[PDB]
Design an enzyme around this catalytic site. Structure first.
Site, mmCIF file in Angstrom:
data_model
loop_
_atom_site.group_PDB
_atom_site.id
_atom_site.type_symbol
_atom_site.label_atom_id
_atom_site.label_comp_id
_atom_site.label_asym_id
_atom_site.label_seq_id
_atom_site.Cartn_x
_atom_site.Cartn_y
_atom_site.Cartn_z
ATOM 1 N N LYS A 240 0.859 -1.220 0.000
ATOM 2 C CA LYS A 240 0.000 0.000 0.000
ATOM 3 C C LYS A 240 0.885 1.257 0.000
ATOM 4 O O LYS A 240 0.644 2.143 -0.844
ATOM 5 C CB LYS A 240 -0.984 -0.058 1.178
ATOM 6 C CG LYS A 240 -1.277 1.254 1.896
ATOM 7 C CD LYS A 240 -2.188 2.197 1.145
ATOM 8 C CE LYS A 240 -2.395 3.500 1.891
ATOM 9 N NZ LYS A 240 -3.697 4.122 1.561
ATOM 10 N N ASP A 259 -5.761 -0.753 0.007
ATOM 11 C CA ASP A 259 -6.034 -1.151 1.415
ATOM 12 C C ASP A 259 -7.533 -1.469 1.517
ATOM 13 O O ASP A 259 -8.178 -1.561 0.455
ATOM 14 C CB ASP A 259 -5.548 -0.079 2.398
ATOM 15 C CG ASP A 259 -6.152 1.302 2.193
ATOM 16 O OD1 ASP A 259 -7.206 1.398 1.532
ATOM 17 O OD2 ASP A 259 -5.558 2.275 2.698
#
Ligand SMILES: O=C(Nc1noc2c1CCCC2)[C@@H]1CC12CCC2
Ligand code: NI
Length: 312
Positions: A240, A259
């Protein structure tokens, strides 16, 4: 001594860049989870620090107005030619956003509906160091708290530039300043918590294991996949955070940070399921899905939806 300029106060210190509001909307970009160093100190007037200088930005329908505070109590003036190029590169204005918006809309009916209301959402071209450590502070956090941690971090470690009203502006620290033996202890006192270890450890790692900030510039010209894998070796940097840095600092427009939040959006609005819940593999599959759908500027299309989602 000095204070924040408005377009009313001191129009002699402002330079214009010809820029429609369909190419750039400051209020959908400057505080929408990309940069955390911009504040609307006066209405429609965004102040922040850009590479050892403070800027204030406002705009009309087809003009972006900007003014520079160089500090050192030196002779104040308009922005220069080189300083306007800096701002042009920062908003990546050479790339047409209208053409991109229409290209993404051609294959995505959902984007087209959202695109209507939310125009001029583009990607800032940020400094890698600033971006890396800002997104190490982003884990299990909100825009408000991240903006606090980053401001306090720059005050504690970064060099002082200028004061306007009751706001002192510090440039972002160098890696050596965050790598010190006391670095973690100070950063915990500033309220980063567990993130304090990752900031110090990553600063120390880039210096010792990668050979300083020239490494992050190497990742800018390296292919997206090589850059992502390199960043994932750093303490507190997973898929991420690596994708965020890739997209926003290393010129990888196809980078799609995934995410639980973009999972929620992908599922609700596109009906997407892994072909159960989150997973390193499932997150990777969702990123490929959006790249396949939108193309090589998939990260820029995500910013439109992301910024659109912040406004209810
Ligand atoms: O996640 C954040 N930003 C983004 N993640 O993916 C994208 C963006 C911004 C634009 C491109 C796509 C920042 C850290 C937070 C958590 C709440 C604010
Ligand atoms: Ni479902």
């Amino acid at each position: 001594h000095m204070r924040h300029r408005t377009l009313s106060s001191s129009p002699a210190l402002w330079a214009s860049i010809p820029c429609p509001r369909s190419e750039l909307r400051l209020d959908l970009v400057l505080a929408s989870g990309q940069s955390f160093r911009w504040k609307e100190q006066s209405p429609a007037h965004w102040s922040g620090v850009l590479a050892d200088q403070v800027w204030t930005l406002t705009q009309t329908e087809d003009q972006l107005y900007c003014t520079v505070y160089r500090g050192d109590d030196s002779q104040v003036s308009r922005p220069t030619l080189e300083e306007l190029e800096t701002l042009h590169k920062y908003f990546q204005l050479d790339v047409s956003l209208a053409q991109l918006y229409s290209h993404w809309a051609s294959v995505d009916s959902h984007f087209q509906r959202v695109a209507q209301k939310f125009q001029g959402v583009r990607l800032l071209r940020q400094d890698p160091t600033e971006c890396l450590f800002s997104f190490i502070c982003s884990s299990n956090n909100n825009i408000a708290r991240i903006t606090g941690m980053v401001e306090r971090l720059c005050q504690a470690f970064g060099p002082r530039l200028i004061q306007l009203d009751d706001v002192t502006y510090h440039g972002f620290p160098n890696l050596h300043a965050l790598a010190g033996p006391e670095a973690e202890t100070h950063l915990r006192k500033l309220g980063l918590g567990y993130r304090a270890r990752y900031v110090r450890a990553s600063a120390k790692a880039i210096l010792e294991e990668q050979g300083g900030p020239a490494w992050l510039q190497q990742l800018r010209v390296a292919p997206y996949e090589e850059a992502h894998k390199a960043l994932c070796t750093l303490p507190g940097v997973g898929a991420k955070v690596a994708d965020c840095i890739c997209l926003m600092a290393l010129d990888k427009p196809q980078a799609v940070p995934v995410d639980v939040h973009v999972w929620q959006i992908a599922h609700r609005d596109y009906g997407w399921h892994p072909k159960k819940g989150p997973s390193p593999l499932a997150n990777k599959e969702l990123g490929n899905f959006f790249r396949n759908l939108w193309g090589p500027y998939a990260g820029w299309a995500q910013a439109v939806l992301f910024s659109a989602d912040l406004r209810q």
